[PDB]
């Protein structure tokens, strides 16, 4: 179990900001404790709240701090640290536990300095370079990463720069059909026929996953045609029990 | 229309001696979010029955049009329902399904309405044996009260249907007294109506496929749950999930 | 005493360097300072031909200092200094304060963090009778009573709802002789109701959106002269028709920052009347609320409902509970622009469990019933939740709770009885709770096809109207909800409709939209509401029952427009069929459905065409009664319309929004009137 | 299939010798049309950049003249789509049909593939949509306007493509690249009923870009970026486009 203390600022009560933060924490698998609350004097005054966050493991803590980063939460002035960096050793592959960018304006802390991320895009990694023009932080998609680059891992040393209010049919006509399809599918299998399946990620998103697995397992399917998403979503469901929440999704593709 | 006929008039029967004069070219949601809900509703419905509570059901003809018919019959048959609120159509469609195995094809439909008017009420079509099964059948046998409220769309109507909407509202209200659960199955207008009349502290389940109806369960998430699949499937699952004892 | 003086500021350091309103978006550093100069010079020089113009020194790093309209508000020797919402303009305040001080004005400063942005957001009636004050985007509602007291003027509050029109002076412009230049689409329904109560129709000049986004309300008026950026010919005729002379001068480099002519000036010589003194319609009230506020988002629920309803708030204190799992407690000062708005807000908070400060608890007000089945004006509308009311110091539980009712108090042997009743059950003698005191709760057709069908049906409506034929419309409340009622009432008014068949609800909501601008509590000027309340249409139901009929409602003046209005004015027969879900009902609703069917059938005789506008229950009823050879158009957004069964020849069906259909229909009937 | 034909081969023509052996309210759509129109006007005057991504439904529904008018009058700086929207728009302008369905009528008993396969074959014969316009056989429509006013367009390949056109990018790594390049500096993106492409384009865009999403299926709810910078409307795309140009006209009155 792990604990952190975060700080949140803005119009906390009327924006629903502090409500969304608490929701993310509990729904993702952690728990919270509001330590203190300074109320602004006027409606447009800013308020502040310090919140202790608990997670059952590191993996779930960094999942939670990620979501909180988007909402603009920060570490105490005393707890600021540099982002951890790990190098790329194979083209197009990121190092384990790489941080996954979002669509929002982002700063990272390097050598005590806060640095703006360029070419900001969601579902990328952040690479760090020392250039003749200083430090460069840019989002890259996984397949653009080159062996040698430094990439942010873990969740330290990252904050977002949002504005303030940036941040503020019929059914047994079916068992009819089913009963028929079931029987056709039977005899074709027995007769040594050939069945082909096309499938979209919606198979995985509903319960469909393990049922299609059985079909293929018990000789009913002789070919499967799909796209990227059905394969990544199936593998995410079986490797983690989730189905896209982007960290899980990107971690699968990278692996 | 049937109710305008006066004793003495001659009326065409059979099909001889009739032709038409047309021109020429006149004539030319998610699903196991449902067994989720179901499994809950099933259990609530259980303990209320055991605890001697009071469950009320509103129902539209769509219950009959899907498989729903016999499943609602069992519910009423096995003590789960203490009142039923509907309109003309649910009663006529249930009776058509049980008397002929059809569900509106207008001859079957009109023949039912005329027969019940001949006997003078639904309870008399049961005492005389022409109705032997179904939703309405069970209500009479087991003395579950029902109110059928008229609409601008009613054929007949049946003698039972309350075509005075003021009294119809007062009868709905009176039978809603002490309700702990209101089970609302695809009943469109009657659901809203019953809603209006019902105070908080009353569990309310709402089923329809139009998830634009469940939209209008604007009460708690702790005193309202709305699902969006057909009542046939719902009432089916609810019946075998209930049956698991 | 008759010499007029303006404060301006030259654009030496002007540019668009940030984005704090929608006009600025995408316009950063796209300002041409040379063109800004020559455009500013144009205004400056036209203005100097009619008035005095003083200048503030421009200041590097505060580009928006050119918009002196936001420096403060001056009346007589007093100025209330602006306090800006955005920090990008907060550095201007010292430079404005300094100018105002050096010119001998008594300077009043608002509390820190209470925004107010000057004559840009507050505008004097030109004959000095009162002050129009805006709120919503910049200035805060709670600054208004400060203006009243410090400048000693009656203050009227107007809520802004369009983010493109974020200052009052972008869509509101009082003129000489009492004329008013404004854009109705920038205000909510209550604010529009207000404007219409204070300014006579012949003196209102409501402008079109084409004129408003060129900033035609952002106008400088001296005597008979109005200066603006750009004016349509329609607008020029309107103004010069009532005696104003229009002067256009291009101000596009400043539109890129969200201002025009009036934004670049501040009139510091304003008419002071001795008979004019402070007056506040703003009301405020402190409520307490407790529970898991941070947790269940209840406190955010309630504050959202206050703003959305047109009020405002200041949280006075928030206190976390004892232990980790305890309840939190807040005290909130709630503000409204009027009592009417305060009652809507407090009704919504009562519902959530908010309660009064012990020091402010009061007995509920009571008024008697003098007519059976009619409530007195401003009765409280009950909810589905358990409720206690306070009578003679005592809180008592309301019995027979039910949502759209009134609460009746009576004396009985065993004590006082508080009873929830529906309107028609109220009996003369009964006492009914009014106001909001003493109450708490204890808790898919393609585009191509819709156009082709609109062609056909329009052609057929025209044909039938010329022939002295008979068109019958059956319509449900969705016609009004969706926003298509003006289109329907225009059809009825221009003679294409010979009978209207409907229900209780469509009649209620259409009278509701015309009396208040809401359909089911949702303001129609906006497409939205955080919730929406039943107060508005229950008040309609009660008012019409009080008169006794929709017709009596029109004769008395309280219904002036809409569908039902037109039916009455042009003697179009309408039938309202009762249903099980009816609130009320209206006196006009037929609750005997045998009679209803009869009346429907009688008004269907000789019908050549029937329009069925999204009302399934009634469309089927009407279809059942109609013989073949009658044309039937069926419009609903749900494809299951497929009950149009009578063939390609005599029944066409279209699957689309009913108001959208009606919108294109009237549009098509217009272009058939061209030759 | 067409692309597999080799020089020398003899192909059957004509028809001889052949047999077979067998939910936004009205009030909201208008308000959004007000906003988006005002924003398109604003951006055009400012020398900004508007990018449109559109699917074949725009043409099916009957909204292509509205789209080609937007492109012609300067409100569109790049067009991102697929093979199908380009084929059907050239088909509507060469023959008046979209998928064999006459556009003068809203209907067809069936509708045939002869018309748009002839389009695919004709354009491959010329070698590009641009060569198709230079030769005179394309005289109007969306793709016409892009060529005439030098509006960059990218056509992304898909698994369902007939042909494809010479202009379709069948290497999707290159496609994504080209999409991303033409998305730089975009202030607004119009997404006209093309789910596959709207998501692809959304994925590549950073916050602070305005995004209007129009589709008739409410699941648009993938407009996730908040009230501030992503508005969604649930209605017919041609109907939207119809009101949009109409609204852009009455802002040109004074
Ligand atoms: N009275 C006015 N319309 N002033 C316009 C002020 C423009 C300035 N950039 C602002 O956002 O505040």
Swiss-Prot record, chain D:
Can you name this protein? Bifunctional arginine dihydrolase/ornithine cyclodeaminase AgrE
Q: What function does this protein fulfil?
A: Bifunctional enzyme involved in a cyanobacterial arginine utilization pathway that produces glutamate and enables cellular adaptation to nitrogen fluctuations. Catalyzes the hydrolysis of arginine to ornithine, with the release of ammonia and carbon dioxide. Then, catalyzes the conversion of ornithine to proline, with the release of ammonia.
Mutant phenotype after disruption: Neither proline nor glutamate is observed in filaments of the deletion mutant when incubated in the presence of arginine or ornithine. Mutant shows substantial diazotrophic growth.
Q: Which gene encodes it?
A: agrE
Top-down, what is the taxonomic lineage of the species of origin?
Bacteria, Bacillati, Cyanobacteriota, Cyanophyceae, Nostocales
Q: Which organism is it from?
A: Nostoc sp. (strain PCC 7120 / SAG 25.82 / UTEX 2576)
Task: Kindly list the positions annotated as binding NAD(+).
Answer: 83-84, 162, 194-197, 215, 236-237
The domain section of the record reads: The N-terminal domain (NTD) is responsible for arginine dihydrolase activity. The C-terminal domain (CTD) is responsible for ornithine cyclodeaminase activity. The L-ornithine generated from arginine is probably channeled between the active sites of arginine dihydrolase (NTD) and ornithine cyclodeaminase (CTD).
Q: Describe its partners and assembly state.
A: Homotetramer.
Protein induction: Expressed at higher levels in vegetative cells than in heterocysts.
Please give the family membership noted in the entry. Answer: In the N-terminal section; belongs to the DDAH family.
An additional note in the Swiss-Prot or TrEMBL entry is: Lee et al. were unable to characterize ornithine cyclodeaminase activity using full-length AgrE expressed and purified from E.coli, suggesting that a cyanobacterial factor required for activity is missing when AgrE is expressed in E.coli.
Instruction: Map out region (Ornithine cyclodeaminase) in residue numbers.
Output: 1-251
Disulfide linkages recorded for this protein, renumbered to the chain, are none
């Amino acid at each position: 179990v792990e604990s952190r203390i975060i700080r949140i600022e803005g119009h906390l009560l009327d924006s629903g900001l502090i409500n969304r933060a608490l929701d993310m924490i509990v729904d993702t698998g952690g728990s919270f404790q509001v330590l203190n609350f300074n109320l602004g004097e006027q409606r447009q005054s800013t308020s502040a709240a310090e919140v202790k966050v608990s997670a059952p493991s590191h993996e779930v803590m960094e999942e939670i701090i990620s979501l909180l980063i988007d909402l603009g939460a920060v570490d105490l002035p005393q707890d600021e640290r540099d982002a951890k960096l790990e190098p790329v050793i194979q083209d197009g592959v990121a190092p384990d536990d790489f941080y996954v960018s979002t669509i929002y304006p982002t700063e990272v802390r390097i050598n005590g300095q806060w640095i703006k991320v360029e070419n900001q895009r969601m579902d990328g990694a952040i690479a760090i370079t020392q250039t003749p023009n200083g430090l460069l932080a840019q989002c890259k998609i996984l397949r653009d990463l080159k062996a040698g680059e430094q990439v942010i891992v873990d969740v330290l040393g990252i904050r977002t720069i949002r504005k303030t209010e940036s941040r503020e049919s019929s059914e047994r006509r079916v068992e009819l059909v089913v009963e028929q399809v079931a029987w056709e599918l039977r005899k074709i299998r027995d007769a040594g026929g050939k069945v082909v399946v096309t499938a979209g990620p919606v198979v995985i998103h509903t319960g469909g996953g393990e049922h299609l697995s059985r079909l293929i397992r018990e000789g009913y399917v002789q070919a499967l045609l799909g796209g990227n998403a059905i394969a990544v979503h199936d593998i995410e469901q079986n490797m983690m029990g989730t189905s896209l929440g982007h960290r899980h999704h990107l971690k699968v593709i990278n692996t | 229309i049937l109710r305008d006929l006066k004793a003495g008039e001659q009326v065409i029967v059979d099909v001889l001696g009739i032709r038409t004069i047309r021109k020429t070219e006149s004539r030319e949601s998610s699903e196991r979010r449902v067994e989720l809900v179901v499994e809950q509703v099933a259990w609530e419905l259980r303990k209320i029955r055991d605890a001697g509570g009071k469950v009320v059901v509103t129902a539209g003809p769509v219950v009959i049009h899907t498989g729903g018919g016999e499943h609602l019959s069992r519910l009423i048959r096995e003590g789960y329902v203490q009142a039923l609120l509907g309109g003309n159509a649910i009663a006529v469609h249930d009776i058509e399904q049980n008397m002929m195995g059809t569900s509106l094809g207008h001859r079957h439909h009109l023949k039912v309405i005329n027969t019940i008017r001949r006997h003078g009420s639904i309870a008399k079509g049961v005492e005389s044996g022409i109705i032997r099964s179904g939703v309405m059948y069970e209500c009479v046998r087991n003395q579950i009260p029902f109110v059928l409220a008229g609409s601008i769309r009613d054929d007949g109507p049946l003698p039972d249907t309350q075509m005075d909407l003021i009294k119809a509202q007062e009868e709905y209200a009176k039978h809603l007294e002490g309700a702990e659960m209101i089970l609302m199955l695809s009943s469109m207008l009657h659901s809203i109506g019953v809603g209006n009349m019902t105070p908080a502290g009353v569990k309310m389940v709402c089923v329809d496929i139009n998830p634009a109806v469940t939209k209008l369960s604007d009460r708690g998430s702790i005193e309202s749950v709305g699902v969006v699949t057909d009542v046939g499937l719902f009432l089916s699952l609810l019946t075998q999930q209930l049956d698991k004892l | 005493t008759s010499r007029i003086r303006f404060l301006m500021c030259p654009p030496d350091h002007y540019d668009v360097d940030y984005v704090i309103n929608p006009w600025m978006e995408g316009n950063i550093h796209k300002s041409s300072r040379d063109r800004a100069v020559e455009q500013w010079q144009g205004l400056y020089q036209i203005l100097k031909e009619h008035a005095i113009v003083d200048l503030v020194t421009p200041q590097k790093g505060w580009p928006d200092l050119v918009f002196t309209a936001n420096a403060g508000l001056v009346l007589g020797d007093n100025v209330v200094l602006s306090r800006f919402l955005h920090k990008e303009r907060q550095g201007e305040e010292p430079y404005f304060k300094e100018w105002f001080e050096g010119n001998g004005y008594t300077v009043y400063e608002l509390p820190k963090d209470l925004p107010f942005e000057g004559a840009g957001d507050a505008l004097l009636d030109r004959e000095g009778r009162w002050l129009w004050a805006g709120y919503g985007f910049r200035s805060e509602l709670d600054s208004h009573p400060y203006l009243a007291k410090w400048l000693d003027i009656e203050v009227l509050s107007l809520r802004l709802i369009d983010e493109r029109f974020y200052h009052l002076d972008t869509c509101f412009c009082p003129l000489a002789n009492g004329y008013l230049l404004y854009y109705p689409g920038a205000f909510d329904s209550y604010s529009n109701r207000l404007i219409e109560m204070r300014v006579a129709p012949e003196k209102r000049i409501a402008i079109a959106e084409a004129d408003a986004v060129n900033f035609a309300c952002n106008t400088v008026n001296v005597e008979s002269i109005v200066i603006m950026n750009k004016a349509s010919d329609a607008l020029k005729q309107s103004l010069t028709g009532v005696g104003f002379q229009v002067l256009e001068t291009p101000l596009t480099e400043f539109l890129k920052a969200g201002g025009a002519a009036k934004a670049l000036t501040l009139r510091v010589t304003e008419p002071v009347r001795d008979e004019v003194h402070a007056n506040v319609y703003v009301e405020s009230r402190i409520i307490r609320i407790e529970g898991h506020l941070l947790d269940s988002g209840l406190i955010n629920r309630a504050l959202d409902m206050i703003v959305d309803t047109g009020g405002s708030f200041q949280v006075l204190n928030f206190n976390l509970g004892e232990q980790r799992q305890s309840t939190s407690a807040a005290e909130v000062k709630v503000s409204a622009p009027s009592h009417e708005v305060m009652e809507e807000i407090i009704s919504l908070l009562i519902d959530l469990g908010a309660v009064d400060l012990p020091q402010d608890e009061r007995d509920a007000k009571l008024e008697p019933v003098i007519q059976d089945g009619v409530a007195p004006d401003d009765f409280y509308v009950s909810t589905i939740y358990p409720t206690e009311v306070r009578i003679n110091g005592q809180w008592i539980k309301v019995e027979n709770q039910r949502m759209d009712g009134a609460i009746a108090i009576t004396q009985t042997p065993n004590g006082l009885l508080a009873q929830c009743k529906i309107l028609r059950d109220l009996k003369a003698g009964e006492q009914v709770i009014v106001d909001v005191l003493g109450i708490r709760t204890i808790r898919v057709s393609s585009e191509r096809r819709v156009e082709l069908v609109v062609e056909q049906v329009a052609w057929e409506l025209r044909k039938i109207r010329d022939a002295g034929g008979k068109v019958v419309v059956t319509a449900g409340p969705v016609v009004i909800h969706t926003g298509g009622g003006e289109h329907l009432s225009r059809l009825i008014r221009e003679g294409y409709v010979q009978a209207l068949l409907g229900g209780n609800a469509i009649a209620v909501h259409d009278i509701e939209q015309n009396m208040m601008g809401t359909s089911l509590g949702v303001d129609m000027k906006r497409g939205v509401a955080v919730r929406g309340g039943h107060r508005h249409h229950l008040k309609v139901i009660n008012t019409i029952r009080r008169h006794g009929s929709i017709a009596k409602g029109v004769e008395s003046g309280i219904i002036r427009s809409g569908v039902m209005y037109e039916c009455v004015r042009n003697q179009i027969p309408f039938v309202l069929a009762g249903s099980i879900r009816d609130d009320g009902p209206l006196p006009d609703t037929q609750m005997d459905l045998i009679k209803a069917q009869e009346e429907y059938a009688k008004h269907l005789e000789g019908a050549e065409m029937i329009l069925m506008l999204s009302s399934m229950l009634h469309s089927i009823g009407v279809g059942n009664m109609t013989p073949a050879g009658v044309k039937m158009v069926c419009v609903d957004i749900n494809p299951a319309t497929k009950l149009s069964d009578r063939g390609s020849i005599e029944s066409v069906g279209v699957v689309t929004d009913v108001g959208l259909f009606l919108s294109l229909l009237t549009q098509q009937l217009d272009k058939l009137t061209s030759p």
